[PDB]
Structures are given as structure tokens and as C-alpha cells.
């Protein structure tokens with residue numbers, strides 16, 4: 001299981017937000033912690049992504065762009081899985097020091113998005129997603145959103161994406177003799193992966209509007225995140241950069 005060995009080997013560890021939980025909840029504090037946590041996780045998504053089999057095959061410029069576009073969705077998918085395994089979807093497990101109950105979901109002003117992520121979290125359970133399916137689906141997620149005008153080396157991207165789909169096939173075929181069984185499973189998983197995109201979009205829209213009025217709500221936007229929200233996120237929102245849906 002060479003491929004799976006690698007994914008398990010590079011899977012990021014626990015990342016904390018640095019949030020002050022002895023402090024009464026406030027929109028400003030929660031969001032500053034969400035921004036900090038997001039920036040902390042990106043550091044790991046970068047090290048993780050660059051260690052992915054075949055990732056270096058991509059053109060330099062395409063590697064960064066792909067990470068930046070997939071950033072939100074990758075965090076959403078992993079957060080849902082954490083919420084499922086840690087608290088059985090009872091709450092959103094952004095980080096051990098940043099757990100959201102409905103009250104926090106409401107005070108964050110991202111309640112609708114959070115409810116969609118709790119549902120995602122429940123999906124991991126209902127579909128009985130295995131730890132290995134999760135790891136392959138996550139890696140696959142990284143290669144599921146590109147520019148309409150294409151990447152610098154679109155062909156190397158296509159091959160890579162195809163190879164990751166094949167890996168998912170293999171993990172599904174493993175311990176499944178009936179193709180019909182493999183087919184339904186592939187159907188379920190690709191359906192789950194697609195569902196992540198609309199979620200990231202709402203978060204993208206939400207974060208973008210917040211940045212634009214950040215000086216009003218007293219939100220301190222990290223330098224790196226600010227740049228990406230103003231340079232990359234608008235491409236996704238304006239339709240220049242779109243996710244690849246299966247269905």
C-alpha cells in the first residue's frame with residue numbers, strides 16, 4: 001500500500017488556534033482566531049501538498065495557485081472529519097481550542113455555513129467513510145478547482161488528477177468484488193466531494209465581504225490571508241476560477 005502509506009505519513013498533525021476560551025465569546029475574537037487558525041493550517045497544507053506523490057510534477061506557478069484555491073475546501077473537509085471522529089458531529093471541531101456549539105456558530109455570523117459543515121460531518125458517519133477513503137478524497141480535493149484559462153501546465157495537472165481518481169478507484173475496489181458495489185461507492189464519494197465546493201464558496205463570499213469591511217467590524221486580517229482573499233478569492237467569485245464537479 002505504497003500510496004496510502006505516503007498519505008498517512010504526510011497527514012498534518014493537530015493544529016491549535018491560540019484562542020482565549022476564558023474570554024466571553026465575541027464576533028471579533030472568534031473571527032481573529034478563525035483567521036489565525038486558517039493561516040496556521042495553510043502552513044501545513046503547503047508542506048503536506050508539496051509532499052504529495054507527483055505534486056512536484058506541476059509547474060511552480062500551478063503548485064501555489066492550486067494550493068491557494070483549494071485552501072478553504074481542504075480545511076472544510078478535514079474539519080468535518082475531525083468533527084465526526086472527535087465529537088460525533090455534536091460540534092464543529094475547528095481545533096481542540098476552537099470548538100463551535102450553535103451559540104458560537106451564531107455569534108460568528110457563519111451559522112448557515114457552519115450548519116452545512118455539521119451536515120458534512122454527519123455524512124462521514126452515515127456513509128461510514130473509512131480513514132483511508134478520507135485521506136484519498138482529501139488529496140483529490142486539492143486537484144479539483146482550476147482557472148478556465150487553464151494552468152501553466154494543464155496537461156501535467158490533468159494526468160495527476162486522473163492518477164488520484166485511479167487511486168480512489170483502487171481503495172474502493174479493495175475488498176469489493178462486485179463492480180456494482182464499487183460503482184455505488186464511487187457514486188457516493190464523488191457526490192460527497194462535490195458537496196464540499198458549495199460550502200467553500202459561501203465561506204469565500206463571507207470572508208471576502210468581511211475583508212472589504214474589516215475596518216468596520218474590527219477584524220485583524222493576517223497579511224498572507226488578506227493578499228489571497230483580494231487576489232485569488234475574487235477570481236473564484238467572479239467565475240474565472242472554478243471547481244471541477246463530478247456530477
Ligand SMILES: C[C@](O)(COc1ccc(C#N)cc1)C(=O)Nc1ccc(C#N)c(C(F)(F)F)c1
Nearest residue numbers: 034035037038068071072075076079094207229
Ligand atoms: C473566516 C476565515 O478565517 C477565512 O479564512 C480564509 C481561508 C481561506 C481563504 C482562501 N482562499 C480565505 C479566508 C475562515 O474561514 N477560517 C477558517 C479557519 C479554519 C477552518 C478549519 N478547519 C475553517 C473551515 F471553514 F472550517 F474550513 C475556516
